Design a protein around this nucleic acid. Structure first.
Ligand SMILES: O=P(O)(O)O[C@H]1[C@H](OP(=O)(O)O)[C@@H](OP(=O)(O)O)[C@H](OP(=O)(O)O)[C@@H](OP(=O)(O)O)[C@H]1OP(=O)(O)O
Ligand SMILES: [K+]
Ligand SMILES: [K+]
Ligand SMILES: [K+]
Ligand SMILES: [Zn+2]
Ligand SMILES: [Zn+2]
Ligand SMILES: [Zn+2]
Lengths: 255, 264, 45, 129, 193, 235
RNA sequence: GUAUGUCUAAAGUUAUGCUCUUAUUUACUAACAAAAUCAUUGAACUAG
RNA sequence: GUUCGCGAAGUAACCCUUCGUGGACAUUUGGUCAAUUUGAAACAAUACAGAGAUGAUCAGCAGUUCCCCUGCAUAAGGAUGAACCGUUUUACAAAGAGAUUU
RNA sequence: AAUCUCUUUGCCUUUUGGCUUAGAUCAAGUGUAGUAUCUGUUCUU
């Protein structure tokens, strides 16, 4: 178990990437920290870093300090503090889900404040008005470096990379759209998995292009819209009725 | 400016709390207008700071805590509260929220209650609603892959099998419940389920785990009285076992359904 | 619950009111009560 | 320090008083408003005038105010915003100015150039010049 | 705070903008405390923002007027003598550094170099006996509890031979008109008239 | 940082505090990068200060001796109108520049009595005082000017700017008030006002042309209202 | 010639009589154009 | 750590030295803030076009607006800064006549 | 007693929305091009 060891330094401080992004213009703006006087087609890049749950997880100062929030950089596989980190370095689980319950209404598992509305691209931290537990997995083409692959193999790879980030409710790969939907048991695990898988690559060491992994642009993991499928919609309504029944007991008990 | 609406659960059980007040310190998450920010800690040594994320006006309109946006009387989310009031009043009450910045600003200036805040702000009606809710509470390639699926063979003691085939999976069932019930039986496990196929496959770490699994009761596995049926799957499986496209998965599900109806 | 309210020692170099900005705002009209218009009382115009 | 919002058009005259209503205002919107300046809200809206209330005049010896629109001079008690008297202002036309002396004489200056003198308590027009 | 590329500097950047309104004051404090020609170097107390946005020189250049008058007089004489005796007085170029040259790092390029001699007119062992040991100090007699009230440097009290020596050293800059009638019809009131 | 927050990356601030465009600017870039007197005055003050500090740095490096330092400082304080553009943004500073020129004259002729022309006078104390006193009064002015500029950066520009009645607006504002008065009198006399006021515009053109204004069928009291307001405008 | 405005179009996938051929007339528009009398000379120049 | 008091060992006994022990002195920092893609800066670039009252070329000043930009600004500038140019049906009644219907 | 269409009366129902020095001045032009346009002739009709 991760609780049996101390966290491991994922990337040494000297190995961290410089805060100055790749040049996309004639002049670097020292206020916004972005290149200016130019234009580019697509600024995304494949994450040089990746979380390895079995290897990196362990105790940090956060566990002793009674920290509630998880480490964002740990999820991204790039935390340089290792055991000295103020935030938790492990996959969210039921015990931590329980301790986060009062803050999770307005904060994600990383402690970032949620918004009223989703970004128009559905990316970001997410809305506090919806207990959204489902992620959209786009950019599969670039994540595979445009490697031709069968739908079932794509689904198997997505299941592998995501199932290790918490309890999964269900997974669907829509070949008609070349996109995947991953639904988690707890929202905090969807938040954590979203940050961990963002900009990652779906390639494996058993692939030809493994050495070219960072050439293109990585996986685009964002929040999922309302599922339009009537079959899903009805079970969503049944979940709502179950939650309301399970809440009426608490209301009659309190009053 | 009225005092902040912070709930007991956010304040905590500590005897005394020091709260920092910052006039115009923040922009309300709901209405985007500036408001007096209050921030505090449950205890001087705690590692987290709790901030009022919404202004007193928006909180009052919604009858919620400024620090956690849960109902100030029932301490539950707005969405669930409005649904619970809808179930008893049949009026289908809801808190509609503005999209445009100008409309958010405009809405926050109205001296009205939104959605269920009407019921929950007046304690008389809240009680007069808890009583009514009590009355509610008490009351095409299938022909090929069907030889890849192990459907001809049976649940048995002798053959050592590390992999199994699951079918008659109701779509309501999440994957984690299946893994959890197998974990309960084994006293603790790679699972594939395709819900459009209504079937899946289970792969164990080593043969003694599969043997311990088959030691406990073609077989059956229970999920809230859903009878998932189970067969030893000696031929190793992958995601391709249940079809390469959606239509193939659905066709497989219908085939398995009629096979189940024949078996029953 | 007894709360001790204290003012933050602000950094004199930073903006004193983080939330202060120029914002146009259309305010709603509060139609709480009707005000009667008590108006009690050939082609030259 | 305070901006009193309520009138739906240009304000013609304002009068300060020592107690609530501390501000009395007349407008082109044909209303006379008595204000609670501390609250910044109107204590009372007087709507009897049909046309722009061009002129007002506080009585120097009693807590009342006169107001006028074309052919219509009215007196109001400020303590409660009650209509006291309707003057015999018929056919006098547009009234540009009002004045009240301590002898209860009310003067109304017509835009047609006619000086009208009235007894403030009765509203009786006693002289036209 | 040379390169504030990291996001951690977002607040410091705002502090920098906030310091701009106080920059003229800091400039005044710096310039009023400028080292005089008889001082090689000068330590000044400074008040600095913790983000490094601004540094204010936090002290007042208090001086003893007859001493300061004598110091500048000795400097004046030394300068006239140097202009007389130096065949080629090479005036320095302005600006001293190229527009493209970044400001030198004090601790790397200046702090280690031994300072050059200041303008100190050679004082006589006997005629300047009473002033020689301290005339060119940064705050002369600051530590002498008899001549000065203390390091706050607010009041001075000198003896006759010292005042005489300061008066004598000040002849090029001191006032020589003892007769008040010199200003007949050439005084404040006659100019007002 | 101020330049870059405004997005003016095409303007480069030299280490001697000169501000120059790095490319030919479009008219929109030129309009947007049109920095005001508060910024330019602050920059010129920084330039003056750096000139002084750099001279002291040259002495500390050992590149100039103490006499060259004193003379250099005196030169700087006497040539602010040449070494900086400060006069461009706050032309009253010419008073200080003139004072320094005058001080140099009285100083040099005292100093050079038996020495003739040439560098070497380092008596910078009087001109230095002149610039310190300039800063004394410039401080509150720049605190207000720069404070307002930075306030606009964080808070944005005010939406409730009330334009005053200046000479360039006098006729327009006079017209607005005249029309409003005429309209009030007409509407109150009557038992589409914008159409009625067209008669006022015609009566004014008639008055200017000395053409008699007479509308057949015009109500007599309204004609008298228009005529009196036309006479008031005429007066 | 400007001010200034507009455009830029895959993917970074969100689940279900009245005309015609054609030779002219007239008007408007063109920073298009080095045009022969009145030892080589308008010549790169004009914008709200 | 220091210091005041007490037990003890060392010394012939003090001073002094060490081990033990009680009291006194000193008493809760900091965050509205985590370190590149996904919680938000813009210009620019390529193309086309080339400014209201005009037959033509233009100075303007305003007003209204939930558009603002530059500027220290209640000054001034930003094409008269821009947008403005479209779409338009009922407080609908009175008098009378000739045809339609039982 | 209830339709339909006339005629008159009423209603005006897409029914002129500022300012200054009429705000000011101008309306003589080659080649070629572009757009619209004109007479005629056959043709369409
Ligand atoms: O122009 P001049 O009549 O010859 O005077 C010059 C001039 O001073 P002013 O023009 O200000 O009176 C020089 O100043 P700049 O031209 O350089 O500005 C100054 O030299 P500095 O640069 O050292 O000020 C020089 O002084 P010097 O006597 O050393 O030659 C001085 O000459 P005079 O005043 O003696 O005639
Ligand atoms: K043009
Ligand atoms: K114009
Ligand atoms: K203008
Ligand atoms: Zn970490
Ligand atoms: Zn709000
Ligand atoms: Zn709360």
């Amino acid at each position: 178990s991760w609780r049996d060891k101390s966290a491991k330094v994922q990337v040494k401080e000297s190995e961290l990437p410089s805060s100055i992004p790749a040049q996309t213009g004639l002049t670097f703006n020292i206020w916004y920290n972005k290149w200016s006087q130019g234009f580019a087609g697509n600024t995304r890049f494949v994450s040089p870093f990746a979380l390895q749950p079995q290897l990196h997880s362990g105790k940090t100062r956060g566990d002793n300090d009674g920290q509630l929030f998880f480490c964002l950089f740990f999820a991204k596989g790039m935390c340089c503090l290792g055991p000295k980190c103020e935030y938790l370095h492990h996959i969210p689980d039921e015990e931590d889900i329980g301790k986060l319950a009062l803050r999770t209404e307005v904060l994600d598992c990383f402690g970032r404040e949620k918004f009223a509305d989703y970004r128009e691209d559905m990316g970001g931290i997410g809305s506090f008005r919806k207990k959204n537990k489902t992620l959209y997995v786009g950019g599969i083409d670039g994540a595979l470096n445009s490697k031709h692959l069968k739908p079932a193999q794509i689904e198997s790879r997505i299941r592998f990379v995501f199932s290790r980030l918490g309890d999964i409710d269900r997974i669907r790969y829509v070949e008609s759209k070349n996109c995947g939907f991953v639904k988690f048991k707890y929202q905090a695990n969807a938040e954590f998995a979203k940050e961990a898988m963002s900009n990652q690559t779906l390639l494996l060491p058993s692939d030809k292009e493994w050495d070219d992994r960072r050439e293109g642009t990585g996986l685009l993991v964002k929040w999922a819209n309302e599922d339009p499928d009537p079959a899903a919609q009805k079970r969503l309504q049944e979940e709502l009725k179950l939650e309301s029944l399970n809440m009426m007991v608490h209301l009659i008990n309190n009053n | 400016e009225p005092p902040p609406n912070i709930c007991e659960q956010c304040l905590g059980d500590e005897a005394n709390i020091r709260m920092t007040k910052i006039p115009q310190g923040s922009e309300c998450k709901i209405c985007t207008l500036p408001f007096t920010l209050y921030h505090f800690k449950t205890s001087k040594r705690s590692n987290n700071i709790i901030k009022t994320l919404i202004c007193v006006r928006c909180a009052t309109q919604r009858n919620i805590c400024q620090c956690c946006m849960l109902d100030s009387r029932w301490h539950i989310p707005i969405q669930l509260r409005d649904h619970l009031i809808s179930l008893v009043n049949e009026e289908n009450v809801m808190t509609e929220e503005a999209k445009n910045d100008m409309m958010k600003r405009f809405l926050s200036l109205k001296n009205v209650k939104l959605g269920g805040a009407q019921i929950t702000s007046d304690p008389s009606e809240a009680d007069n609603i808890v009583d009514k809710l009590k009355n509610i509470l008490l009351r095409v390639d299938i022909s090929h892959i069907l030889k890849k699926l192990p459907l001809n063979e049976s649940f048995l003691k002798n053959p050592s099998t590390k992999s199994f085939f699951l079918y008659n999976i109701d779509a309501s069932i999440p994957e984690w419940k299946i893994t959890d019930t197998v974990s309960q039986l084994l006293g603790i496990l790679s699972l594939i389920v395709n819900h459009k196929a209504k079937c899946g496959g289970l792969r164990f770490q080593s043969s003694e785990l599969g043997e311990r699994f088959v030691s406990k009761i073609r077989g059956v596995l229970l999920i809230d009285r859903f009878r998932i049926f189970i067969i030893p799957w000696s031929s190793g499986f992958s995601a391709a076992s249940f079809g390469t496209n959606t239509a193939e998965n659905i066709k497989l599900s219908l085939s398995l359904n009629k096979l189940i109806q024949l078996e029953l | 619950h007894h709360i001790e309210v204290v003012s933050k020692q602000m950094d004199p170099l930073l903006p004193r009111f983080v939330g202060k900005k120029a914002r146009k705002v259309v305010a709603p009209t509060e139609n709480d009560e009707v005000v009667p218009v008590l108006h009690m009382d050939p082609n030259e115009w | 320090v305070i901006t009193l919002v309520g009138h739906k058009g240009p304000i013609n005259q304002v009068q300060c008083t020592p107690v609530d209503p501390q501000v009395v205002s007349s407008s082109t919107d044909a209303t006379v408003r008595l204000w609670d300046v501390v609250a910044g809200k109107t204590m009372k809206v007087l709507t009897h005038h049909k046309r722009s209330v061009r002129a007002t005049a506080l009585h120097p010896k009693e807590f009342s105010v006169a107001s006028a629109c074309t052919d219509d001079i009215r007196s109001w008690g400020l303590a409660e915003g009650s209509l006291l008297t309707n003057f015999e202002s018929e056919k006098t036309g547009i009234i540009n100015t009002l004045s009240i002396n301590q002898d209860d004489v009310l003067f109304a200056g017509g835009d047609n150039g006619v000086l009208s003198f009235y007894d403030y308590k009765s509203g009786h027009k006693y002289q036209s010049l | 705070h040379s390169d504030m590329a990291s996001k951690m500097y977002n607040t410091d950047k705002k502090a920098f903008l906030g310091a701009l309104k106080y920059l003229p004051h800091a400039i005044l404090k710096l310039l009023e405390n400028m080292p005089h020609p008889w001082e090689q170097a000068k330590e000044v107390k400074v008040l600095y923002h913790t983000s490094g946005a601004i540094t204010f020189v936090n002290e007042t250049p208090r001086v003893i007027e007859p001493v300061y008058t004598a110091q500048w007089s000795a400097t004046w004489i030394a300068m006239r003598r140097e202009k007389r005796d130096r065949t080629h007085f090479k005036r320095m170029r302005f600006p001293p550094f190229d527009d493209d040259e970044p400001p030198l790092s004090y601790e790397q390029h200046i702090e280690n170099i031994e300072p050059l001699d200041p303008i100190n007119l050679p004082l006589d062992s006997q005629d300047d006996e009473y002033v020689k040991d301290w005339l060119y100090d940064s705050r002369p007699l600051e530590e002498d509890s008899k001549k000065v009230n203390g390091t706050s440097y607010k009041k001075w009290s000198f003896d006759l031979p010292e005042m005489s020596n300061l008066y004598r050293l000040s002849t090029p800059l001191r006032d020589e008109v003892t007769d008040k009638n010199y200003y007949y019809l050439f005084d404040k009131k006659s100019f007002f008239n | 940082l101020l330049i870059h927050r405004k997005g003016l990356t095409y303007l480069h601030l030299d280490y001697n505090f000169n501000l120059k465009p790095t490319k030919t600017l479009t008219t929109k870039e030129r309009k947007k990068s049109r920095l005001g007197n508060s910024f330019h005055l602050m920059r010129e003050l920084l330039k003056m200060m750096k000139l002084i500090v750099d001279t002291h740095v040259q002495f500390r490096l050992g590149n100039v001796d103490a006499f060259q330092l004193a003379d250099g400082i005196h030169y700087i304080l006497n040539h602010i109108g040449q070494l900086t553009g400060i006069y461009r943004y706050k032309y009253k500073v010419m008073h200080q520049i003139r004072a320094c020129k005058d001080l140099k004259h009285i100083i040099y002729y005292k100093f050079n009595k038996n020495l003739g022309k040439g560098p070497g006078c380092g008596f910078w104390q009087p001109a230095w005082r002149v610039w310190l006193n300039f800063l004394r009064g410039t401080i509150p002015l720049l605190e207000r000017y720069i404070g307002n500029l930075i306030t606009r950066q964080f808070e944005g520009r005010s939406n409730e700017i009330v334009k005053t009645t200046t000479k360039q607006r006098l006729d327009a504002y006079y017209d607005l008030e005249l029309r409003n008065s005429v309209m009030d009198d007409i509407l109150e006399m009557m038992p589409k006002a914008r159409t009625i006021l067209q008669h006022l515009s015609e009566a004014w053109r008639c008055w200017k042309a000395n053409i008699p204004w007479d509308v057949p069928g015009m109500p007599a009291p309204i004609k008298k209202i228009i005529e009196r307001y036309i006479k008031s405008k005429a007066d």
